[PDB]
Write a protein that binds this DNA or RNA. Structure first.
Ligand SMILES: [Mn+2]
Ligand SMILES: [Mn+2]
Ligand SMILES: [Mn+2]
Ligand SMILES: [Mn+2]
Ligand code: NA
Ligand code: NA
Ligand code: NA
Length: 320
DNA sequence: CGGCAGTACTG
DNA sequence: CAGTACT
DNA sequence: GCCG
């Protein structure tokens, strides 16, 4: 990154807007920061600032105040609430609205939350694992978690296919959680497995707490056996084989990669989700879907790229 | 002016 | 439904 | 915040 001296300061304001609930302004900052981190050379002119997609007049002005003065005075007017709102919204299950409500009610520390706040079931689990959930794990440990789920799944049906997606599949050295996708090539035997699979993982002691238990999605907490182990977040999705390619693409990410690709599809009158790539989709003047269109056959990830007119990218080049 | 991705849970 | 979460 |  040629522009750490710029992006380091803009990241502060981006995080401030985000925890205060100003999601679209934070998005614009997030995109500009990416754009700046991907420029070869230092940005050296307001004229050169507007040069870059994602950088407008306002952002170019901020970047020159930085280069001219080495500082951005807006940083000096960030609300004193922001560090506390960040502290609170790092509880899993608590977002901007809950953080702001706790702040208005007078809470300032996790001790205040522990002793006085009303917590949902999810948020109490988040708070108990507050430190662990902020830690990333070595990818070697993500491998061990993937293999634990796979062995429990294969015990029921040898045919079950299990793959760790997310940051793991994109090749990152550390992983925030493990994202495991499960399917069955026979198109049928993925059905109703969560019952037995989660109970198998729970009877082990591996699965320690459940956050979301849906028909297709599980989000929870696991811990490998032995000393020196931390609790780790584990996400599992079970999908029919016909949706494997789109589910794999979705679950491998990155999030910004997915959003960019789905935006591309929309410009082309198509729609991309974890279920399918569809064409001939009818939308209104607000970009909202009002006609469903037709599902396109996508037996592999490469087919999704091809149908969108894009060169294929391996998971490691999706790490946007 | 107004979209900025598309979807799944929880309560 | 609003809120939060996933990539 | 940016952009069509
Ligand atoms: Mn992940
Ligand atoms: Mn995850
Ligand atoms: Mn722990
Ligand atoms: Mn993530
Ligand atoms: Na630009
Ligand atoms: Na949170
Ligand atoms: Na009090």
């Amino acid at each position: 990154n040629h522009n750490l001296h710029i992006t380091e300061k803009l990241e502060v304001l981006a995080k401030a807007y985000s925890v205060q609930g100003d999601k679209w302004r934070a998005l614009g900052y997030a995109k500009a920061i990416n754009a700046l981190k991907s420029f070869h050379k230092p940005v050296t002119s307001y004229q050169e600032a507007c040069s870059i997609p994602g950088i407008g007049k306002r952002m170019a002005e901020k970047i020159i105040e930085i280069l001219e003065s080495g500082h951005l005075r807006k940083l000096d007017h960030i609300s004193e609430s922001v560090p506390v709102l960040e502290l609170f919204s790092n509880i899993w299950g608590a977002g901007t609205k809950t953080a702001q409500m706790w702040y208005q009610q007078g809470f300032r520390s996790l001790e205040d939350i522990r002793s006085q706040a009303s917590l949902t079931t999810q948020q109490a689990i988040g708070l108990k694992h507050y430190s662990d959930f902020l830690e990333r794990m070595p990818r070697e440990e993500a491998t061990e978690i993937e293999q634990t789920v796979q062995k429990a799944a294969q015990a029921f049906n040898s045919g079950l296919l299990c793959v760790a997606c997310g940051s793991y599949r994109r090749g990152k050295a550390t992983c925030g959680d493990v994202d495991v996708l499960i399917t069955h090539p026979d198109g049928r035997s993925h059905r109703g497995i969560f019952s037995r699979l989660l109970d198998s993982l729970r009877q082990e002691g591996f699965l320690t707490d459940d956050l979301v238990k849906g028909e297709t999605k599980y989000l929870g907490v696991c811990r490998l056996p032995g000393p020196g182990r931390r609790h780790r977040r584990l996400d599992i999705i079970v999908v029919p084989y016909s949706e494997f390619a789109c589910a794999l693409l979705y679950f491998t990410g990155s999030a910004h990669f997915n959003r960019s690709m789905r935006a591309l599809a929309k410009t082309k009158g198509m729609s991309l989700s974890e279920h399918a790539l569809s064409t001939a989709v009818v939308r209104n003047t607000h970009g909202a879907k009002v006609g469903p269109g037709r599902v396109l056959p996508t037996p592999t990830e490469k087919d999704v790229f091809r149908l969108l007119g894009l060169p294929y990218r391996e998971p490691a080049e999706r790490d946007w």
